[PDB]
C-alpha cells in the first residue's frame, strides 16, 4: 500500500520496499521495522492492514519526506545562493561545491562535454 504522499511500494520485501520512499533507506527502514514490531523479512504484498497503518503512521509522522523534504533542501540552497555565499555561487553556476578540481572531469555536476577548438 501507499505511504508519504502516494509512493506505493509493492511485492519484493518490506525492509527493501521501504527504501523506495523519499527520505528513507537502509537505517531509517530497519529501525521503524522493529519499532513498529513488524517482521522486516515479510513481503509488502501481504500483511495485516494493522501492521500497515501502524507503519505509515510512524513514518509519515516521525520525519519529513517527499514534498516537504525536497521543499526544505530547495530553500536551504536558495539560502546559500542570494546570500552571496561562496557555496551559493558554486550552486549558481552549477559547478562542484566541495574541494574537487574542475580542470578535469566534474562531469556529473557539469553536464556532458561541450567540445571546442585547440
Amino acid at each position: 500500500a501507499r505511504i508519504a504522499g502516494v509512493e506505493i511500494p509493492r511485492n519484493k520485501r518490506v525492509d527493501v520496499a521501504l527504501t523506495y520512499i523519499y527520505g528513507i533507506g537502509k537505517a531509517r527502514a530497519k529501525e521503524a521495522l522493529e519499532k513498529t514490531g513488524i517482521n522486516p523479512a515479510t513481503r509488502v504484498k501481504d500483511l495485516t492492514e494493522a501492521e500497515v497503518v501502524r507503519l505509515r503512521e510512524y513514518v509519515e509522522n516521525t520525519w519529513k519526506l517527499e514534498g516537504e523534504l525536497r521543499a526544505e533542501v530547495a530553500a536551504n540552497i536558495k539560502r546559500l545562493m542570494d546570500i552571496g555565499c561562496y557555496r551559493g555561487l558554486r550552486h549558481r553556476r552549477g559547478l562542484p561545491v566541495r574541494g574537487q578540481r574542475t580542470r578535469t572531469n566534474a562531469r556529473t555536476r557539469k553536464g556532458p562535454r561541450k567540445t571546442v577548438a585547440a
Binding site: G5, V6, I8, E66, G67, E68, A71
Partner: protein, 181 residues
Amino acid sequence: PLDVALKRKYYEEVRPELIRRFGYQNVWEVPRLEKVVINQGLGEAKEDARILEKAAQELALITGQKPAVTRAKKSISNFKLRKGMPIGLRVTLRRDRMWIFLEKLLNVALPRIRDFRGLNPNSFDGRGNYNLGLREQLIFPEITYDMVDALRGMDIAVVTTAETDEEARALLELLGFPFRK
C-alpha cells in the same frame, strides 16, 4: 438518492451563515451552487482514439456519468491536429450527482494529493466562479491504481450563482474548501 450529506450541510448551516454574513434580503439572492463541469483536455490521445474509451470509462467511474467527447474546432498544424479529431472528454454534473461527487472530492481526493498546502485563493474568475486543475486521476477513491496505464489530469469548473468572488469564496469556504488563504 436525494439525501447526500454535503447537500444537507449546505442548507442546514451554509446558507444561514451566508445570509448572516452578506445580509441577503431575498431567498434566491443567497448563492446557489450549480453545475460543476469536469473536463479532460486529452489531446494526448489524438491519433489513438482507442486510448480515449479507457479515459472516458474512468471519468464515469468517479462521476456516475459517461462524459461527452469533445472534438477539434479548428485544424492546427503546430501540434498535429486535423480539424475533426477528438481532443478530450468533457462531463457536466449537477443536482445531487454533482454533490455526491463534490463530497467525495472534498473529503478524499484533494487529501490524497502529494504535498497539498491547499487550493489556490486567486483562481476565482472575477464574476465569481472557480476553476482548478488536477494532474493525476488516481487520487480519487474509485480508481484502483492498477487500472491506470497513463496519467491524465483534468480542469474542474465550478459555477455559482454568486455575483462576485467575495461571495463565491465564502460559499465555498463554508462548504469546506481547503484554501491556501
